[PDB]
Design a protein around this ligand. Structure first.
Ligand SMILES: NC(=O)c1ccc[n+]([C@@H]2O[C@H](COP(=O)([O-])OP(=O)(O)OC[C@H]3O[C@@H](n4cnc5c(N)ncnc54)[C@H](O)[C@@H]3O)[C@@H](O)[C@H]2O)c1
Ligand SMILES: NC(=O)c1ccc[n+]([C@@H]2O[C@H](COP(=O)([O-])OP(=O)(O)OC[C@H]3O[C@@H](n4cnc5c(N)ncnc54)[C@H](O)[C@@H]3O)[C@@H](O)[C@H]2O)c1
Ligand SMILES: [Zn+2]
Ligand SMILES: [Zn+2]
Ligand SMILES: [Zn+2]
Ligand SMILES: [Zn+2]
Ligand SMILES: [Zn+2]
Ligand SMILES: [Zn+2]
Ligand SMILES: [Zn+2]
Ligand SMILES: [Zn+2]
Lengths: 340, 340, 340, 340
């Protein structure tokens, strides 16, 4: 009837670990006993209110929560008790609007978002819509599979809308939580990978995961450096948390190329309209992934083409994590482990 | 042997109409007798030499020249004497690079541009690369058709890359020189047209052209109004690329929609990352088009679907024409008449 | 503190899944919480007690058990709690006898064997000697690395003792648990691989894994076939579970070749002395691998050169699994899943 | 032009001493005038033609012929007329194949064998390939050195391939024609020698030759006695390969040890898989040796470390010699003496 859970109550203030009531699945709902729970940079963005539309206080964050179905509301037909599932950013959608009908539920205006508009995986249990949960492969442990619930599907989908094809060069900008799995998805999709970040250790993580080439934007110029090394990229995926770089990216691509954007730092970035028009460049925002995207991203994980580099932490360690994530001191992803 | 031509000998200085030697077609080249020559703002930028890469002096502007093939060099098979052809912005391309081989010759690094990097149609005669000239429909007069070489293909290709389809909504931002042509192309492409400008006259014209909706941004926030009314436009064509138009386009576009930019404004534009990523927006640069694009845009004119607003002027009065353009006194397009 | 475990109580009898006391780490010992546990055919040999030296009844089998160190006895230095480790056939050696001093601890007459002379990994927990455990790479999941603890290390060392070198031919007889990863190690060691088995699906597996040539022993005499096809092999590794395969292997090598033996079916095989002597043939038994062998064989898996073909099963179904393995219905390895 | 020689004209029939022409050397060949000619059991099998591959009829046996170079063909530099040479089992090899290029001429597919596939030293003269003759030491009589061409190099190479080091234990199984020479080589090679036989006389000879330990398998189990006593032997040389000696060898040998087989018995021997594998035992066939092996074996005799037990007989009495051989009446080795 009661559960441990990390709750946000003030934008900018440390999360408190409290013992709140356990959510109960009504008709058409399910309950999930959380086994592991990934920490996304989005969680930071939320807890501080970096965004135009802010979460409602108080709430439990976490949209990379994974575990077992521990209760099944009325008439649930897609999942049964004991099912291995995850609860991603896209908590639910309406299912019949133009977006939803075209398989673009990620754009649904009636969508609810896990760990934001509704409570998420930073708790021992969480109620979910069984129609939008990720169905997890048994062969991958909860801790390893957790980051795929967002970092994975996001960059998988991001790479898809770069409109690049096998044999072509793609640039991953920002080799962090999203970045480091993006390199892996790219290679599995037959692409050649170039990497850029501000820390040489993150570039080395990239090189190990498959990237053929890397650059430190802090050193010399990333764009210019890339035009010389590979003759510009066919595509670019931006997972960086800095507005600048959202600008340097437009210069790393060859004419007719496409830059896909995953990062969500507040503010604008400078777009050279003249060159964009003259070089026929495409800039494209990519928001997480649909249910099919998610299932496919999970499939890559299942086959071992993608393995997330994760650090373990305890629910109680929540705030220590946030700090180091802000400090850019995290290698890959941090995952809260509930295994008591 | 000798011909009259408008010549730029010093950037910024009023053109002088000089008697100059009629250019002769060598092997693989043809000669064209100009009957009409389109004028547009691009010609101002070539004359002022105010773009990042300047024309070489001296030179003859004009990339909307049309007339008859009056002489054919050796090894030419695409056209013959008497053929009615146009010499558009894309004078030539290398034909072997990645872009050229993939049908994107407009992105060719080695391309030459009529009335900019080589002499153009502000003269009685012009030499052209037969592989890159436009094949004019007999159905349409020289004056009427000239603007289609530039304004026509630009907005047409711009509409194509909005990845919209018949039945869907498109916003035509700016109903001026390009805009009033874009409306007609949009209608012929089965699109529902929403017209946006600040000029009541231009909006009335848009309505007369078949625009289903017309919003004056002076009195009404088009972004807010369109979202409320139609949930946004699947596609947005920005024919007048000001920061205000760019920002508003991002506000007007439906989630997952596409914005095509037809202009070449100076400076960096501020681009809101959050909106672009969350809304899954595509931003795409597009000016003029490939040889295929041009032929297709020409066919719409031939079939009576598209008719440019045009007035004529004499070669001797081009400086006055440049005057009207700079002061924005031109409704539609001005076309130099070379016919006797 | 109790735990589930598959126990052999009588030779030839079905194993029973009993509740048994959790083994505690004495001084110099550590406790391992099993996450996965590979099923080796040696386990069937033990449960049936068909070797001259029987295991003591009762006993828990399993020498491919992997997991996290869950407890540390006094005086342990080699590893710490949380460490990823595996417990191989060679549970421990005396450390100071002639064999141990020369790095051949696999020959120690005072050695203990996991899942044979001491309890193994068919249980939730296993106590182990930290000086002899496998130190697992983070890169590889428990399910996939499990077969390396014996299947991998055994055939890797076996291939080493064939005295073959890069470019030369090696034959793998019996493409089962050991055989199918042997093919992979062979390739990683620069050898050309030939495959022999009595099942087409097995040989198709070998072909997928890099076998340059393959032949079904049931369809033709494999010795004659290989002599004709590749001119005889420089080396053979025998991992088959039938004595006939041992006899046939001796005829597969070219003069001066080496046959290494991993397989352990009961009984004798026919050694043609005359030919062995005249042709200067070497026949060599190879028993699992040393700690050095194990570490190196693990490195090959971490780098992606070797990936075990694995299907998971539950502790409860260990008897059905033994059955399928007995009748040769398993493709690759079966690994018991102990994860949450 | 004619000479006397013992000739096999029908398999199994008694040999006849016939008058045949002296074989004359052509280019690259030399002629040897026999002073002594060793006899062994291989000569019996040649005369009986009971081996898988038979001699061609008719032919003169003898692969242990020693004497002076009495004539040379053109292009001979390794030896000159007057040189004391022996004509061993390996008459010649192609010199180009994979085996020959690797110093393993004994494995050459196109090899010819003296007194088997080509005429041998059972005659007054014999033609040889100077590139393959043994170069005899000045200080050892012909009669005494003859057996080294076969028995000598056989047990020497045999001992070498056991891969035993000075100081280590080696078992000489069977102290007969080969065994009694093997004991001496083993001691010269710094090995500790354990002798095994079922004959007290032979075992007493072993002790006389430096055998540190002697055990009669008739009275006591040599395997048990040796494992208990010295911990098993690092190496075992089986010079009389019966199934018994073979199986006892597997028992006597230390774990990771090597068993070398010198005999050529018929049929397949039952080989215990469990023992060979678990003990990490090497079983290796070895008879005669390479040209370097032979020169090395000859050096030992020259230095007085090895002296064969020899009894002389006349050419005319070869049939009687074959008789005593067949009846196992020969102590040591019998050598035909062609001296004045
Ligand atoms: N569209 C989507 O749904 C998608 C999905 C979740 C991630 N988000 C966002 O994506 C961003 C990244 O996600 P994350 O969890 O991996 O954050 P992260 O902290 O794990 O990784 C960020 C990386 O960006 C790097 N970086 C910072 N400045 C840089 C620069 N100037 N150039 C290059 N690299 C730079 C850091 O080194 C770090 O490696 C976050 O803003 C997050 O909110 C959106
Ligand atoms: N000496 C050691 O170091 C080594 C290590 C452990 C494994 N063993 C033994 O190795 C053997 C194999 O292990 P496993 O787990 O891979 O068993 P397995 O059942 O997985 O594989 C056995 C394979 O042998 C094949 N086979 C059967 N008859 C054959 C024939 N006549 N010719 C060719 N192939 C034939 C089967 O098709 C099968 O593919 C077992 O006996 C096991 O006990 C010893
Ligand atoms: Zn996220
Ligand atoms: Zn919807
Ligand atoms: Zn123009
Ligand atoms: Zn080109
Ligand atoms: Zn095993
Ligand atoms: Zn030991
Ligand atoms: Zn002999
Ligand atoms: Zn040869």
């Amino acid at each position: 009837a009661m559960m441990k859970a990390a709750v946000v109550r003030a934008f900018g203030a440390p999360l408190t670990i409290d013992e709140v009531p356990v959510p109960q699945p009504g008709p058409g709902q399910v309950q999930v006993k959380i086994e592991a729970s990934g920490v996304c940079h989005t969680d930071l963005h939320a807890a501080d209110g970096d965004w135009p539309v802010k979460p409602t206080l108080p709430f439990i964050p976490g949209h990379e929560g994974v575990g077992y179905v521990s209760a099944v509301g009325s008439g649930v037909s897609r999942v049964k008790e004991g099912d291995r599932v995850g609860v991603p950013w896209l908590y639910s959608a309406c299912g019949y609007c133009e977006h939803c009908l075209q398989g673009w539920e990620t754009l649904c205006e009636k969508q609810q978002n896990t760990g934001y508009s509704v409570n998420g995986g930073y708790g021992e249990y969480v109620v979910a819509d069984p129609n939008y949960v990720g169905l997890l492969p048994d062969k991958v442990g909860f801790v390893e599979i957790a980051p795929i619930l967002c970092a994975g599907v996001t960059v998988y989908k991001g790479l898809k809308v770069t409109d690049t094809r096998p044999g072509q060069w793609v640039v991953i900008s920002g080799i962090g939580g999203l970045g480091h799995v993006a390199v892996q998805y790219a290679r599995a999709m037959g692409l050649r990978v170039a990497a850029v970040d501000i820390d040489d250790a993150k570039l080395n993580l990239a090189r190990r995961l498959g990237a053929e080439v890397a650059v430190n934007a802090r050193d010399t110029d990333p764009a210019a450096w890339l035009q010389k090394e590979i003759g510009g990229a066919h595509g670019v995926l931006v997972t960086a948390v800095s507005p600048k770089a959202f600008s340097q990216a437009i210069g790393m691509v060859r004419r007719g190329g496409t830059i896909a954007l995953n990062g969500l730092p507040p503010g604008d970035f400078g777009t050279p309209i003249f060159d964009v028009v003259l070089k026929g460049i495409t800039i494209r925002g990519s928001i997480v992934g649909t249910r099919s995207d998610l299932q496919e991203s999970l499939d890559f994980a299942a086959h071992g083409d993608v393995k997330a580099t994760v650090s373990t932490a305890k629910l109680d360690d929540v705030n220590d994590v946030f700090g180091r994530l802000r400090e850019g001191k995290v290698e890959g992803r941090v995952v809260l482990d509930f295994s008591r």
